[PDB]
Design a protein around this ligand. Structure first.
Ligand SMILES: O[C@@]1(CNc2ncnc3[nH]ccc23)CCCOC1
Length: 167
């Protein structure tokens, strides 16, 4: 039993809710919140920009030190950093960004990072400003993640379509 509330149950391990991931994380304080990161951990917009704003830019400061030490992530890769005031940990995961011409096949690799964590609050990878079809992203999530994932979909209109079209 966990403290995630109000989710629709898509599968054995995947749950979905129309919610702002920022407001969700502040309420639940999960062990892990997933950020929709880019390889530079530049959290300018989308989910990343919003999560960073909620940390008062502490996420960006930590991220800049991480990059200065380690260099950029790989597309499809991840790193574990602090969750600041939102969660114990933040798993920064880089899905392919279609608006940059990145290979959508790397989306499965991106979701594989979730399997290293027993429970996660997460967005749909490569959705929103990363330009991929959120229906496809949900499909890959369900077919790749085996740990317990609580998906937050910000757009209510998108949330209803994801449920109504889920096979
Ligand atoms: O752009 C989308 C992804 N963005 C977010 N997802 C969850 N919570 C969020 N809070 C702020 C942004 C944000 C909107 C939701 C559906 O997929 C694309």
């Amino acid at each position: 039993v966990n403290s995630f509330s109000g989710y629709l149950k898509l599968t054995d391990n995947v749950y979905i809710k129309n919610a702002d991931i920022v407001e969700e994380a502040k309420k639940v304080k999960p062990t892990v919140v997933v950020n929709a990161a880019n390889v530079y951990l530049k959290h300018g917009g989308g989910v990343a920009g919003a999560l960073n704003k909620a940390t008062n830019n502490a996420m960006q400061v930590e991220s800049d030190d991480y990059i200065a030490t380690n260099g950029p992530l790989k597309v499809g890769g991840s790193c574990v950093l602090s969750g600041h005031n939102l969660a114990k940990h933040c798993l920064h995961v880089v899905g392919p960004n279609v608006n940059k011409g990145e290979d959508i096949q790397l989306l499965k690799s991106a979701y594989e990072n979730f399997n290293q964590h027993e429970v996660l609050l997460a967005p749909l990878l490569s959705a929103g400003i990363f330009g991929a079809d959120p229906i496809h992203s949900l499909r890959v999530c369900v077919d790749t993640v085996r740990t317990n994932v609580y998906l937050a979909v910000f757009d209510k209109n998108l949330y209803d379509k994801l449920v109504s079209s889920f096979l």
